[PDB]
Amino acid sequence: WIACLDKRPLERSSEDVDIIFTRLKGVKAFEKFHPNLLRQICLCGYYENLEKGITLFRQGDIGTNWYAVLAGSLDVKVSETSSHQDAVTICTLGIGTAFGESILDNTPRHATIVTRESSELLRIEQEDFKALWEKYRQYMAGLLAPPYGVMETGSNNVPSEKILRAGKILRIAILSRAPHMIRDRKYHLKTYRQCCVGTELVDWMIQQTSCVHSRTQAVGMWQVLLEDGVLNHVDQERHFQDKYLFYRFLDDEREDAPLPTEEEKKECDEELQDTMLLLSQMGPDAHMRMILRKPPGQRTVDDLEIIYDELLHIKALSHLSTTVKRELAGVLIFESHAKGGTVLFNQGEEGTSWYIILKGSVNVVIYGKGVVCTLHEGDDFGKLALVNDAPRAASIVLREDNCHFLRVDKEDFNRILRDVEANTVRLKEHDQDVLVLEKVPAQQKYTVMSGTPEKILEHFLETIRLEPSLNEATDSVLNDFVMMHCVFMPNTQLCPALVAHYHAQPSQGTEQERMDYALNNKRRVIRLVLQWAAMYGDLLQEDDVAMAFLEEFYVSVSDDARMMAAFKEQLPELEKIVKKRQPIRGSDEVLFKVYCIDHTYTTIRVPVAASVKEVISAVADKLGSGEGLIIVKMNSGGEKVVLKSNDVSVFTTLTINGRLFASLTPLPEQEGPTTGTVGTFELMSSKDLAYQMTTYDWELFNCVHELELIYHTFGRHNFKKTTANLDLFLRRFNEIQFWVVTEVCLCSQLSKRVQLLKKFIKIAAHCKEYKNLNSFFAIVMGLSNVAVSRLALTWEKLPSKFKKFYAEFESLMDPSRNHRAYRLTAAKLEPPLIPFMPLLIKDMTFTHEGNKTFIDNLVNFEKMRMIANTARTVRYYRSQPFNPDAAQANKNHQDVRSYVRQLNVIDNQRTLSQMSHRLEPR
């Protein structure tokens, strides 16, 4: 769709307009637009991909364009004077919002609008927009600010359509499967009619799906129906409870209630699981609203956690830190207003609160100018209340009925700020920050927030508790530094620094205390070195600086073996011994074939960790360096990419069928297989295939060193070391993915093509049972490919029970609330398991890009801990060996093993889309 939008309006065809429309349908901004109006926007709209900090226009300028936000958010700034640096930020708009319609009557811009993050916009020019307004004026009244549109959308009672059906479907399911749940019940001399019991509804919901993982989560989903009037407490309680309390469904209020028909039961079978997925998405916010209705002081510990978890998904709060957000839950106010036109606050009043829109829309009004812009769900306003004692700079008028707000008061937010500062300890040199610490509630434990490498090291050393009983808690504390040091303090600095600390002199204390210091300091440095050696581990210590330090450090500690040497016996083990799949080491020499144009072999013998500069040198061993264009990564689609000279261990960074080169045309072999399976894997046992897949997947998984996750995230070149093991384990996800796509597309007959889907679903099931979530996800993704989803006739013939299996598997792939479905699923499983690795990589990549490693000359150690948290999660997943659980691989399944480990595949989407169309025409 970006391709279409880049093109000129007059040049894009009718099918070009079709696919941008398919994109802009789901786009939150246009979800209220008329279909015909939208197509005209598609026809004449321009695309804009802007950076952070770009001002589109200033207050007073001549407007040229109207805008609609597709990605990101922007600030609205207004000055009361004629000087731009008196401009206060009054609001922020994002995904749901459009702006700039003042160009319709040549009105000078009301405000200055600047991006606050990387943003994507659609824009329409003034003449296209004026013309558009003339033709579709009737459909634009609610969308545009007055005088161009109307002030209030209420234009002067809702049981939601989808919740009403949701409640209806679930009730059919209950009556069919567990009729005992809906009956007349009696308690305390009173008889209550056709009703349910709270706990039993929670019991039922848990057993009837795989997407509900706690009694708490189930309460949130039932609240969706109770909030909307669809499920009603037998008295008038406003909230659903996991208790012995009675509740009655809506169409059970009728006394003359008829039995569900055969046609009604049929559609319940089709919709139930899909209804469950909807409620699981709607549940968390309905639960937050329920809790927030209780005043601050009456919120339990569990209450706070329910609020907090949802707050992390509200974009307007994301800029705030973890400590602040954790405190916010206890203070946050929920607020609902019934009628549009309600004035929330007036310009010139005391700015007491900041607001965030959970539901509805508002008009921002400045006296003397009118409606400056309109805000929608997700947007925020009244920000100045948390900056100054200045009065309100604008007025807020409700644009529609039934608006919900999140509210933050000035007294509370300021109390929260100084409480966390009073909990912050700052060490200073020349009155400049050098170490920042927060206290740990739960001898005084601290958490390292930020500091210089030297003070961070100094801190972690002093914290080392030597008491042998506190053995692993001491090791646990040191792990973040030891695992992450390479980023902020590479061995170049750490190793000399450790030497100085070992030979350091006491600067404080009694004469007797200063005599003792040298001992306790020396053996604290030793403790760190041991764990530091245990991090890099055996056969990764092949760092020159690191080995040199250790040799001399052995001499130093030997010199004074006079007091305690009980841990000195642990040092020559790491000195003498330094100075299935096997893990690729980087020093390992590898024979690699390189190609020139007209496809010619060049077998080279280099270490894995060799640089691109080191590659060229061995290529020119044929004599004749510096000729033509050298070294390019070759995609199977033809997409050529050149790599820089300081790149390391490139060989495993290729696409599945990619080749390394030195116009450019790919090898004919890079197009993969031409014919399908023919018996083989599809006549093998699904459980056997999955077992052999999982066996293999562990071998690669256990080859991956924990520091490889660190190198990959922070850039491979910056450490000059390999990630070969991780690279091959990551490739396997795509290999399995494309393997499903390849074989399905290569199957010519429909009868046999349906049998493949059946088999791939079966293998995915057994993968999940073995706790191989990686390969499970890889299959499900390949099964979700456009070239496979398109085959409607294939899915049509697929038996109903396998359709239910795949529906359940898809729901687990739900990206909703940062892959919540997956997170809750993975956490309840025990250590022997393989995670959805692409997500773990993406987790670390997101944290790296969203936070600065150096915050103006100080290390962001809070950032370091967050990356290390995901890495430590891998260690937990590998902390137990994979059990075949007997009765399986008894030296006979060599055929299944051989197939699994030697997958030949098509990684070219175009080829696979063509093939998909030739099987089942559009």
mmCIF file of C-alpha atoms in Angstrom, residues 632-641 654-661 664-667 670-671 738 907-910:
data_model
loop_
_atom_site.group_PDB
_atom_site.id
_atom_site.type_symbol
_atom_site.label_atom_id
_atom_site.label_comp_id
_atom_site.label_asym_id
_atom_site.label_seq_id
_atom_site.Cartn_x
_atom_site.Cartn_y
_atom_site.Cartn_z
ATOM 1 C CA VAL A 632 27.211 -8.727 -2.137
ATOM 2 C CA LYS A 633 24.485 -10.643 -0.284
ATOM 3 C CA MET A 634 22.217 -12.309 -2.858
ATOM 4 C CA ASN A 635 18.535 -12.868 -2.050
ATOM 5 C CA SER A 636 16.604 -15.569 -3.946
ATOM 6 C CA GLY A 637 14.321 -12.779 -5.190
ATOM 7 C CA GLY A 638 17.397 -11.009 -6.573
ATOM 8 C CA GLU A 639 17.582 -8.279 -3.917
ATOM 9 C CA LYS A 640 21.309 -7.468 -3.798
ATOM 10 C CA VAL A 641 22.843 -5.866 -0.678
ATOM 11 C CA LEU A 654 22.317 -15.160 4.808
ATOM 12 C CA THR A 655 18.746 -15.961 3.751
ATOM 13 C CA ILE A 656 17.970 -19.719 3.540
ATOM 14 C CA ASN A 657 18.741 -19.952 -0.199
ATOM 15 C CA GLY A 658 20.943 -16.839 -0.248
ATOM 16 C CA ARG A 659 24.453 -16.842 -1.698
ATOM 17 C CA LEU A 660 27.624 -14.793 -1.191
ATOM 18 C CA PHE A 661 29.072 -12.988 -4.221
ATOM 19 C CA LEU A 664 23.835 -9.508 -10.733
ATOM 20 C CA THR A 665 21.676 -12.593 -11.326
ATOM 21 C CA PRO A 666 21.056 -15.408 -8.775
ATOM 22 C CA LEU A 667 22.015 -19.067 -9.296
ATOM 23 C CA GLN A 670 18.534 -20.588 -5.398
ATOM 24 C CA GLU A 671 14.940 -21.111 -6.559
ATOM 25 C CA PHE A 738 8.722 -21.847 4.277
ATOM 26 C CA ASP A 907 12.223 -18.918 0.261
ATOM 27 C CA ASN A 908 10.948 -16.773 -2.639
ATOM 28 C CA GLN A 909 7.470 -15.323 -1.963
ATOM 29 C CA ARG A 910 6.756 -14.320 -5.592
#
